[PDB]
């Protein structure tokens, strides 16, 4: 399948109560492997998955120095961004940055991305050609002009097409037993009477990885997104994921309904009936 | 791996 690496930076000002708080995490696919919290005691980049810990001490010295360096620049950014919008020094504000690279089933570069956000709003993003910027407002135009003069995109394109994918493949090979597996969803179905003439059918998908999954309900074989309810896929907290989908049906008619589970760990999609 | 280059808005 496809694979990906993403880093997430969040920094939150707290005026009158110290420096902003900076947190960084890195993911491969749907699996966290590093974290950094500028309030935690160790002041170090830390491993969050078993395969990254065989990198050696130089990786961690390396990544810690860099993550500390970028923690300072989002600190400055909060100052700068408050000036661009002429907001007061009193209010707490947040800054986010995401970037990463995608890789295909043959492990070659697919796409790259690098975007910035201010108080939960899109501020500037690297377009798909990795050569020009999408800036939203007028304050972002300044940032766009600064980054254009600085050739930031050329530098970012070199990372995303080189360092990034190469290290993704490295992680993908060192984490082979966790990152390249497919756990088929364990499935069951539950039935709860609601009235004396209505009943809820819940279709369950447990213990599946990766997180992409499709749960669909049909009535007599025709898709039925009418009286349904479909919860967000959630982490199980041991690396696997969980999902369910429910439909309320008139009692005496449960056998007309089918749930269809589509997942990559399933050679053929799964039909379940009560 | 984190990207090295330090950018500012």
């Amino acid at each position, epitope marked *: 399948g496809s694979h990906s690496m993403r880093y997430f930076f969040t920094s939150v000002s707290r005026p009158g109560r110290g420096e902003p708080r900076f947190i960084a995490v890195g993911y491969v696919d749907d699996t966290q492997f590093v974290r950094f919290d500028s309030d935690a005691a160790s002041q170090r980049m830390e491993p969050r998955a078993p395969w990254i810990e065989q990198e050696g001490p130089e990786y961690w010295d390396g990544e810690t120095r860099k993550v500390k360096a970028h923690s300072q620049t989002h600190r400055v950014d909060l100052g700068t961004l408050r000036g661009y919008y002429n907001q007061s020094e009193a209010g707490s504000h947040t800054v986010q940055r995401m970037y990463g690279c995608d890789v295909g089933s043959d492990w070659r570069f697919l796409r790259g991305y690098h975007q910035y956000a201010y108080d939960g709003k899109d501020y500037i993003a690297l377009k798909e050609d990795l050569r020009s910027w999408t800036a939203a407002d007028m304050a972002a135009q300044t940032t766009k002009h600064k980054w254009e003069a600085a050739h930031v995109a*050329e*530098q970012l394109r070199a990372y995303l097409e080189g360092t990034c994918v190469e290290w993704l493949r490295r992680y993908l090979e060192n984490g082979k037993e966790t990152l390249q597996r497919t756990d088929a969803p364990k499935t069951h179905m539950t039935h709860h009477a609601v009235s004396d003439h209505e009943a809820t059918l819940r279709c369950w998908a447990l213990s599946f990885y990766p997180a992409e999954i499709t749960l669909t309900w049909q009535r007599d074989g025709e898709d039925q997104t009418q009286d349904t309810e479909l919860v967000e896929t959630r982490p199980a907290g041991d690396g696997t994921f969980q999902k369910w989908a429910a439909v309320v049906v008139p009692s005496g008619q449960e056998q007309r309904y089918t749930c269809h589970v589509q997942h990559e760990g399933l050679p053929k999609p799964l039909t379940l009936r009560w | 791996r984190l990207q090295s280059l330090q950018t500012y808005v």
Partner: T-cell receptor
Amino acid sequence: GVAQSPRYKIIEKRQSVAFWCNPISGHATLYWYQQILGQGPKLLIQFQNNGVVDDSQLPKDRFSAERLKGVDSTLKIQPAKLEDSAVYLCASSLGGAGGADTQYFGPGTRLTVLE
Amino acid sequence: QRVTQPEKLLSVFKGAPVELKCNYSYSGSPELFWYVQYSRQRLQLLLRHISRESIKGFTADLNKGETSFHLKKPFAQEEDSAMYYCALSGFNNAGNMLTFGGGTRLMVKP
């Protein structure tokens, strides 16, 4: 362009001296460089907005710099040594990437410290 | 971020080829620049690696095996007489700080 004052300066050793630098309007990165005769410029201190980014190769025992409002900056030598005779260059960048960017230089301040 | 310009002085005739050496030693991620200062003029940028640009007839190519960024030009002109400085922006240093080489004076005899 970048402005610097004064252009030339003679002082006796163990004395003090202050250089002044006005960046190009709106540049968030400001640099102080020392350029000794026969050598390239050597970075003293780098500012982003009003904060210090790189203090490392700055003699803190005698050199001190300030950019309180993230515009103009002042560098001070107290007290001066003979080895401080050099051209002191300030410079600035738009600031989107600090020193990984074009740096625009002032004319410099030729300091001459004498016995 | 060592930047080594081996020659201090380079003397050539108008219309002869120009090669200003630059080697560098940096364990991290670098960006490479050449800066120039014409006489009674300010230190100013000449070119940047990642711009893939040619300025005033000048080209330089980053060789990562040889860790070099030599400045080359096939036909020297008198307007080219100036001081040249190799520079390294080091991304693993705070603020991607810049380290200059020692300089090479270029004299193009008329």
